[PDB]
From Swiss-Prot, chains A, B:
Cytoplasmic topology ranges: 1-304
Role, per record: Cleaves the C-terminus of replicase polyprotein at 11 sites. Recognizes substrates containing the core sequence [ILMVF]-Q-|-[SGACN]. Cleaves and inactivates human TRMT1, preventing tRNA guanine(26)-dimethylation of tRNAs. May cleave human NLRP1 in lung epithelial cells, thereby activating the NLRP1 inflammasome pathway. May cleave human GSDMD, triggering alternative GSDME-mediated epithelial cell death upon activation of the NLRP1 inflammasome, which may enhance the release interleukins 1B, 6, 16 and 18. Also able to bind an ADP-ribose-1''-phosphate (ADRP).
Gene: rep
Active site: H41 (for 3cl-pro activity), C145 (nucleophile)
Region of the whole protein represented: 3264 to 3567 of 7096
Subunit text: 3CL-PRO exists as monomer and homodimer. Only the homodimer shows catalytic activity. Interacts with host FBXO22; this interaction promotes the proteasomal degradation of nsp5.
Catalytic activity, as annotated: TSAVLQ-|-SGFRK-NH2 and SGVTFQ-|-GKFKK the two peptides corresponding to the two self-cleavage sites of the SARS 3C-like proteinase are the two most reactive peptide substrates. The enzyme exhibits a strong preference for substrates containing Gln at P1 position and Leu at P2 position
Top-level taxon in the UniProt lineage: Viruses
Protein name: 3C-like proteinase nsp5
Compartments reported by the entry: Host cytoplasm; Host Golgi apparatus; Host nucleus
Domain (Peptidase C30): residue spans on this chain: 1-304
Regulation: Inhibited by pyridone-containing alpha-ketoamides compounds 13a and 13b. In turn, alpha-ketoamide 13b (tert-butyl (1-((S)-1-(((S)-4-(benzylamino)-3,4-dioxo-1-((S)-2-oxopyrrolidin-3-yl)butan-2-yl)amino)-3-cyclopropyl-1-oxopropan-2-yl)-2-oxo-1,2-dihydropyridin-3-yl)carbamate) inhibits SARS-CoV-2 replication in human lung cells. Inhibited ex vivo by michael acceptor inhibitor N3. Inhibited ex vivo by compound 11a and 11b.
């Protein structure tokens, strides 16, 4: 029993982190096979960051300008290319600690672990969600760029995020490992405002199911609702609309608890309308939306 | 910017986790040098757990009865002993992945990372505190026992916790790596009730400092207080008494923010007396007490 905000074990990713230095800029790279992936803004002076032309800036860079260090050993760079907003540095040595891996582009509401790194060195691991506005609420200081987000399925790391920037509002933007930003963000020091940070309804429901499983039941009520009725309340409270797809995804938690999804919707409806009245659920005073149905099942069933 | 509940990278500990099987009971062991450490209740049938005599039960166990598996390779057990509530199994092979390590017995209020494991296999990593009642609020299913809590100082893992049991209230009890329980708990299936779960005042203050540093300032007020006046309010709200030692420990955060510790105490006082009025601090609707002053400094300064 007990339910915690839980990250994947980070060892497989720790083995992939390197330092990338171009001139005076240092950040993190991800070493997989004989390629180091890093944000392309490694080639910029903060002077460059106001309106960088990356193709023009990259013309001035040779393989020997990219200093790649894995622990205290230098890697030999034998090629470099720009894909979207990442650099791919070809090195002469395959990473011997390369795990089975995939690159995946996640959807808003999907959770992942971040291994925060500075100078290629892991500092910590936490769990995030891709927000519906394609920001993430991270913990990232200067030097953290190139830190990655990932999921693990048994022995296969799916890399979904690389950190590129903080918005003036202190939220985070980054790319998949093909270098494509999540959302409308660009790697420039310009006015970039996030949209509405809506609550991931299907995740809140999953976490309400987790609460029931772990003994927190005070919020269960005598009511039910319909997808359309629930969605009217969701819209009013800046909750994402709930679809039959979300209902289907909640089926196994429905089944395990014997609480119909639409009954738990009616519980959530009363919580939105009435607040917590100073009570807590799984040690939270607000409705947690950074657990997926898959996450709740995993943690509640103990998958490794 | 951003402030997250952050665990240590788990790789160094992942390399130490093994499966220990005695008869039909499987749990986790910690392999350091040529010793595997595990809960002594590995030798029990759940029948035994009602009033086990561990010395008598252990007489019936030989080295060959302890099945130790690291990945899919069996370790040869060449000795076994009971220290307090842990077994130390001597194996014929030093763990090649043994990190620099220490065993430390932590104080209530101290935070650590847990690597939750099942069958010697890591499932996840989260951050905990030793509660003032010497429980921890974990996420532990059957098979998770022998999972460890740790801190990392650069390259040295300090092991502070091994998981032994859930109380009927769904909170967790365990030992240091010398096998001594935190608090008054015993490894028996008996009536064991936790004391008052008081709030770790010095940690809440640290986290208020973290909030200011990361831009959440609405709760800063025009007031100050004294240790004695604050402590009257702390007692009323089941907060731990604040000492000059706690004030001294908060000095660097005081200095960085230019907010006197006693001013932040007066902020905390008004939050206790007035509640959050539906507002949040670092994405929480309650006062977080599982960040130490050291944790706040670390995450805010980016130590690896
Ligand atoms: C994450 C990190 O290490 N850094 C923050 C970004 N900074 C350069 C930069 C400025 C503006 C926009 C972008 Cl995409 C990058 C480097 C340090
Ligand atoms: C943690 C774990 O894997 N398990 C929970 C404890 N259980 C045996 C037990 C019962 C009662 C008290 C104690 Cl200390 C242990 C084994 C499974």
């Amino acid at each position: 029993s007990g339910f915690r905000k839980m990250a994947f074990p980070s060892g497989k990713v720790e083995g992939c982190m390197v330092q990338v230095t171009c001139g005076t800029t240092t950040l993190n790279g991800l070493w997989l096979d004989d390629v180091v992936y890093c944000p392309r803004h490694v080639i910029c002076t903060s002077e460059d960051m106001l309106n960088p032309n990356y193709e023009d800036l990259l013309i001035r860079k040779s393989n020997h300008n990219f200093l790649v260090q894995a622990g205290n050993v230098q890697l030999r760079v034998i090629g470099h290319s720009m894909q979207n907003c990442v650099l791919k540095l070809k090195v002469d040595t395959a990473n011997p600690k390369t795990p089975k891996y995939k690159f995946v582009r996640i959807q808003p509401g999907q959770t992942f672990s971040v291994l925060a790194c500075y100078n290629g060195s892991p500092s910590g691991v936490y769990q995030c969600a891709m927000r519906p506005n394609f920001t993430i609420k991270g913990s990232f200081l200067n030097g953290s760029c190139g830190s990655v987000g990932f999921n693990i399925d048994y022995d296969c790391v799916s890399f979904c995020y690389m950190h590129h920037m903080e918005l003036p509002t202190g939220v985070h933007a980054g790319t998949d490992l093909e270098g494509n930003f999540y959302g409308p963000f660009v790697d420039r020091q310009t006015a970039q405002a996030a949209g509405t940070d809506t609550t991931i309804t299907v995740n809140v429901l999953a976490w309400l199911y987790a609460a029931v499983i772990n003994g927190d039941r005070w919020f269960l009520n005598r009511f039910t609702t319909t997808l359309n009725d629930f969605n009217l309340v969701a819209m009013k409270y800046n909750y994402e609309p709930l679809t039959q797809d979300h209902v289907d995804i909640l089926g196994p938690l429905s089944a395990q608890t014997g609480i119909a999804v639409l009954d738990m919707c009616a519980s959530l409806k009363e919580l939105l309308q009435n607040g917590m009245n100073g009570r807590t659920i799984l040690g939270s005073a607000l409705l947690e939306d950074e657990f997926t149905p898959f996450d709740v099942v995993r943690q509640c069933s103990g998958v490794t």
